[PDB]
């Protein structure tokens, strides 16, 4: 659990412990209880009271249905479809659902091939109840527990590659999971397929560096093959990030962030060569040696 | 071409080259890795005067050829006093060929 | 997620000794003015949607584009979502004023929105004209005295606009 | 981080509604508490270093063992007493962080989170620092409502302790 | 049924631990907000029908067109008066509860929770109540702390209807 | 879900009506003797490790055939879980003592474990005696005065020795 | 940086074998129509300089919120800097619809601009509507003969529609 | 890189509109003050080498672990690097001072020297606390008065320590 | 997730041949060291709560600015998790020397938790210089025989350092 950086992180927005909803719960806390479902089915995306489905909405409050079951009564949902399924690419759709319905980013390109096939298969609505109906699902919280995202905690089954993947799929509080700097195309399956994840970037007022992404042409994977071979330097080298490089004009940069790997004995001049421009550092990182 | 008029297959540097395709090395590294190459320094620094290499050297990388002789007097101590990979370094990092 | 007193006291825990008394002094003053901090609060808080109301009112009377069809604000369901959003903006302040710290409005804003906002095509200087205009009428509504006991609220002018700013500049 | 208010606004963001007067009556309540615990407080800073010696010292006391024997967790050489009076200090200068910030917060997240594992891994008693909170909260030497609620705080630890 | 005492257990349970300093704060500063708030909502219940009339005649005469239109939303019968006023006394006697129970959960769960559908179905207009709790809170006649709470429970009525 | 007010609440809007003049007294009485209830609370709250320590040690002493092999308390979890059991007990009489009424022990505890136990083989007899123990041992810890000053909190011992029965009689 | 015959040589290559018959039939009538395309880039390329401030002029009188102060593209440098990036985008859909390969467009355009327009905080939906109303005007503006041999410019039609879909696409 | 005038410039051009008035007297109150800030910044200016001594000689005091072998600050040219990130850290300080702005030093050293630290395995603790206790030293440095005639540096002390904190709250 | 016969099967299937003889040889002779392999695995695997308690206890004897407060490791609940992230890749260790593959290693720590140690602000060299320190303490607790018969681990040390350096580059 990321207490020193939860400032930087956005943590401590989600410090905050798992609802829980009791034997005989009040009339007003089933209302609570269905607002952090909305929020955390839908992404942090704001319902309009028109939209509410009341009717599937009614029977939580009066007990015939599960917590689970409404978490699964709003993913089977037609507006659901509408805000994730339909205007995304199907790794997108199951990287989503992972991050909905358990918290947790997918750990391998085999567990995306099962989901995959499972669609294809039998239909979205099948492949979310195998989604919610799991082991994982049931272990890490309850049926009556709203699901939350466990990825700070070790939690006895976390790879390492869910906490640094967690945060390319979740910007901050604020951050409304439609509207993301990526877009449509699925951040996590590049660095899936591959087996290599990414230093991880925070959000703005925090970090004014969230503005580096990696592009599509060229991959870094973070690890400097020479130690300085090709640098020609005894240092040890880094790997720099930098944002927006927007003080040079459109002849002199042709991208505004790009990475680049320094030694350390030259690392402060590259740093105030890199400050002139305007650029944003989201990230330093070792790189080797 | 542009740093030592023509390469020969063992003056072409494997790891440089290889380097460059990736990614992970700019041209200006390129550049100084040609620079502080051993067959560079063994055609250009040790035959030419101190002088006559940083008149070489600076026409070669900044593009421009020195402004005057004083202009290279000026250069040339850097070359003794901390070494030819502190010059180099000197020379890459200033506003004209950076601009 | 921080108090002033929390603030005190993770800063005397990263120096390692115990509280100063320069330090105890000034949390005295501001717990004597704490009751002072936050009855203006109550007075920004009971006023919350005339205050976003009016808001809005004079940012579409100020940029009819957003108003025009094509415009980000233009459509019912989008219109909605901007108030919405703006009554988000100020219930963080009274949060971060209630606190007397901002970084409760840093942590639950500040650093996602500015990238929600550009990832939404949400023009940014809308909004921050729209939060610079919602922070003064906030203070011009907490200014006027009626009916209460008289105090001075000076202080609090300059926090509650110190807060309204860094949502501003946080927004851009 | 357990402190009023800012649980205050955990209640009032989850709910998702604004504030109402429920966190002023909070607040007056807030403000009632820190009006003595502000020099409480400060007067656990004065007497701090005399109580973390007392404190060390009653426990040596109590169990005469752990300066007898040898073994890198007990304090029979030096460095074991440097270090275990070390964390009396550390306690008590937890105490006096949560007498300040007016919840038992700063000791949950500093203190009590990991400290069954630590004396798990570490062959600690729980007990020895039982004891010196005991002696804490006979010796600290204030009196009235502020003396209650310090007793409070110490005996949470002592709660979470054992 | 959000008042300070349930949701101060609501916080302990949801954390799954005992009673802290915390709560023992919230309760002093709940007894000092009642000491006085139980006396403003009797002075309340003394004044309440004539409160009740004049926020009705208030409502009547800056919506004039209410009492004339045939409608029977609008209030041209009798029986719109009656039912009316009915609720008039209704919006008083929420704002009476929400004084004794020291928060805003007996209006949250009697009035607000479903008043915007209502107003929806019924095509009743909420200026007209807003227009009532605005003369209410102006001819209370309380005097102090007490008067300023009870306007924060009426502005809160407002903000919830507009 | 209940506290003494929204009860009164409660059953003044079954009635219908407002909340009559006695009722207002006897809140009134009830405020001011609330904070008495909750003084004695804190020390009721203070001593509990103390409070289900000896409880579970008078009554693995008393009945040592749930400490014998076989027995419903043997096993290192079981026994564990017995304490955490007595423990939640506790936990929520003092969650019933503070909002002062047993709507809250009987909404989080009595309705479902006394099935529990029944289900589990459980013996209803021994954690009844248990919780009798555990509560006539924190009603002589709540009574005895010690640097406090003089207070009447004796109904109060009515109050919870009620809140201590009920827990008891619906564990059965 | 591939041609249609390099595209064809490449996979051929990839194949490992020699081209078969069947693409060297197709490369036949693409060499038949290459000048289909060649006529219709040509009358593309010359009124380059009208399409572009047609599409600005379009863009700007349909979101003026970006010619209002605080707007992305409000500044006098900024907006020159807009007309620049449009001219870009059309100056490399001309390109690859010379070599009749959008890997060109791909290379030189695509996969970093789409990272910078977010990390400038550009709105990419209106640099994508302008783009989509400029690859309009341009195939309005190619389809029309004035004193040219009658041809059939419709197969170029879809492909000069891919290619400013896949900018537009690609911008975001 | 702002002043004050020229973020009360960008400011009035986010707004569309002209300065208004109240922000044209607070100027004039901050260019009758700017010598008197900068009064202050040049009697900070002057003791700068001594500063960063002392300040590095209190916390090599504090922290015997950073000179201890194996320590961050241990090595020679390490220790020689420490000084030159203090001293450049003071100078942006007095940058920002001068120009009565923090962007300054938000754009210099605040967005990249976190991650360098962290990078770089330096432990952001220690120069936290250095700067910390830099800053007091320059305050109470500047705050004394030696050939200057009395005035009120209260509103500076303020924006000192304000810079202070936030060079020493971004260092981390 | 690979054995050591699964990576032979993997390697044989990529040749998309049968396993030639030298590799059966090879595996034969792993057949017989696997066991030689395991029992060392199982006198590391039983000391293992003594090997990081001593690993953690030089450690913070060499580097006592982690235990100093605003050190990474100060807190109770961060120390804690340290001494869990330490154990955790000893298991890991001990998985990787278990199925005579580093890839399971790989697979379930490396390429994530360097990134982690990273964004957490937690120092990498620490946590370097305690993976050496436990492997260098683990080779000497599997090298000294008691109760065993003799054998030849040379193949043992060599794979199980090599493990132990690959998990100290890969935190780094
Ligand atoms: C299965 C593989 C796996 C690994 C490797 C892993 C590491 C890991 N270590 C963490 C924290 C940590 N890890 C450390 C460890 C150290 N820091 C130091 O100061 C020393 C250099 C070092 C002791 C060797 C510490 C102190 C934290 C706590 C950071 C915090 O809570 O703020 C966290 C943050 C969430 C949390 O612990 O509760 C993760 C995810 N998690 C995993 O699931
Ligand atoms: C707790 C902190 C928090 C913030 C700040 C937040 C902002 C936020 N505003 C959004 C949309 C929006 N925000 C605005 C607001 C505006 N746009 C304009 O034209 C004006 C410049 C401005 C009015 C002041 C609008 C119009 C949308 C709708 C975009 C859309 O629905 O397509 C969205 C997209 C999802 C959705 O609303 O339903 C998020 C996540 N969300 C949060 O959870
Ligand atoms: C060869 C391929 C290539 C592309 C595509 C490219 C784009 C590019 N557009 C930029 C700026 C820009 N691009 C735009 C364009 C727009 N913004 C808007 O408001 C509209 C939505 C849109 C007009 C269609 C604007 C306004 C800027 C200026 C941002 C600034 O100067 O702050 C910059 C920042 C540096 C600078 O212009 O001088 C780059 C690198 N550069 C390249 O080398
Ligand atoms: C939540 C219900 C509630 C309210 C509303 C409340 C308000 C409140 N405001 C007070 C004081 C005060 N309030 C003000 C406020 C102001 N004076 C000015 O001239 C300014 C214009 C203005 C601020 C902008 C002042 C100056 C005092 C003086 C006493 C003090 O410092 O508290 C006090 C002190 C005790 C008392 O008056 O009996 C109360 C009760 N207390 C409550 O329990
Ligand atoms: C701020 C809250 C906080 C607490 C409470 C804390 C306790 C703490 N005490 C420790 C050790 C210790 N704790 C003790 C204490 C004692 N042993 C005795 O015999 C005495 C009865 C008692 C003296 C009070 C000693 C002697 C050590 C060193 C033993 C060791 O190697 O682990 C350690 C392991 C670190 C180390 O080995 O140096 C921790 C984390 N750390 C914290 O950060
Ligand atoms: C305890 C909280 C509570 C409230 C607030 C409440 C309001 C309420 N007012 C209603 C109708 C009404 N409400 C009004 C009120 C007015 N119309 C006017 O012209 C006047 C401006 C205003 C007088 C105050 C009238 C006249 C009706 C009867 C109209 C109808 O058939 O629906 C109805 C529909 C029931 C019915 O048709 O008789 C409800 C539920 N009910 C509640 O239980
Ligand atoms: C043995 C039976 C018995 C009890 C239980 C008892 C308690 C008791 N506590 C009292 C007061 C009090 N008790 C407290 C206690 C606290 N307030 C806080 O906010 C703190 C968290 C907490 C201490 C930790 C306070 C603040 C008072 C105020 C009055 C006084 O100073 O006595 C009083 C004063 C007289 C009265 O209330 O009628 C009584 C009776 N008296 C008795 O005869
Ligand atoms: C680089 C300088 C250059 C140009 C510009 C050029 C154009 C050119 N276009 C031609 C034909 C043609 N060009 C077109 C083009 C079109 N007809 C339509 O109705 C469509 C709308 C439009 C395409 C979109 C057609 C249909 C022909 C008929 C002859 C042919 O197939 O080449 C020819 C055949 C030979 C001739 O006309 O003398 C020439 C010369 N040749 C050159 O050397
Ligand atoms: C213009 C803004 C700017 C900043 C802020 C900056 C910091 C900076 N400090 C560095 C090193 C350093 N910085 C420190 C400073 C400290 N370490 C400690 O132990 C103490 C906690 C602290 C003394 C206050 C040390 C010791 C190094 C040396 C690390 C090394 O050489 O291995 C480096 C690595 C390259 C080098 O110094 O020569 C950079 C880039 N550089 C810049 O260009
Ligand atoms: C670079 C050469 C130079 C210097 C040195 C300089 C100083 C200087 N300080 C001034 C004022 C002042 N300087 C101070 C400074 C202080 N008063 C206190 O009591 C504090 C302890 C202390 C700050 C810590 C004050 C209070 C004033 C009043 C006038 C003003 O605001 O400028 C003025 C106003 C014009 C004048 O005095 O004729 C001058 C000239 N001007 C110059 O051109
Ligand atoms: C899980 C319970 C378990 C254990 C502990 C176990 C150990 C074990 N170690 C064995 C062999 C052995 N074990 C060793 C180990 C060593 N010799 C040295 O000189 C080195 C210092 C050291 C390794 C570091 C050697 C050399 C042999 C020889 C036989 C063989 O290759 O297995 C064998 C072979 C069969 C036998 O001894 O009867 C057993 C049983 N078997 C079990 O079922």
Known sequence: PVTVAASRLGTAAFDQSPVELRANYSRDDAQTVIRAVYRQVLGNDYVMSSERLTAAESLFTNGFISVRDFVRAVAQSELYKEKFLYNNFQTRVIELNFKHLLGRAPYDEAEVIEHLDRYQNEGFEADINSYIDSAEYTENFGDNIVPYIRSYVVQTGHRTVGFTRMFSLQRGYANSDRAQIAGNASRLAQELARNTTSAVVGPSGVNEGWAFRSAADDYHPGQSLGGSTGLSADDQVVRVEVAALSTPRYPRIRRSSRVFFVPVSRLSQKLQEIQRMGGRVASISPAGQ | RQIFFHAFKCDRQQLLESQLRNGQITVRDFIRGLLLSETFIDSFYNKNSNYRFVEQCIQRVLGRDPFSEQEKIAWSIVICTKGLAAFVDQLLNTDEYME | ?172 | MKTPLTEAVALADSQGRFLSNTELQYLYGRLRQGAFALEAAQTLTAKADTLVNGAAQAVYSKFPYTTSTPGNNFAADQRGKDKCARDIGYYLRMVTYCLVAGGTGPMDEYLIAGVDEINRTFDLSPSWYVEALKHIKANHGLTGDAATETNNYIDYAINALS
């Open chain 3, 1 to 172: 997620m921080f108090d002033i007193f929390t603030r005190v006291v993770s800063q005397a825990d990263a120096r390692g000794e115990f509280i100063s008394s320069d330090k105890l002094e000034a949390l005295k003053k501001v717990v004597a003015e704490g009751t002072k901090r936050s009855d203006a609060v109550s007075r920004m808080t009971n006023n919350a949607s005339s205050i976003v109301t009016n808001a809005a009112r004079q940012l579409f009377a100020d940029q009819p584009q957003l108003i025009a069809p094509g415009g980000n604000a233009y459509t019912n369901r989008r219109m909605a979502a901007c108030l919405r959003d703006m009554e988000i903006i100020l219930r963080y302040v009274t949060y971060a004023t209630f606190t007397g710290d901002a970084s409760v409005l840093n942590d639950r804003c500040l650093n996602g929105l500015r990238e929600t906002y550009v990832a939404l095509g949400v023009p940014g200087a809308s909004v921050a004209a729209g939060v610079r205009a919602m922070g003064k009428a906030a203070v011009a509504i907490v200014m006027d005295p009626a009916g209460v006991t008289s105090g001075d609220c000076s202080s609090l002018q300059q926090e509650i606009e110190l807060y309204f700013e860094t949502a501003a500049k946080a927004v851009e």
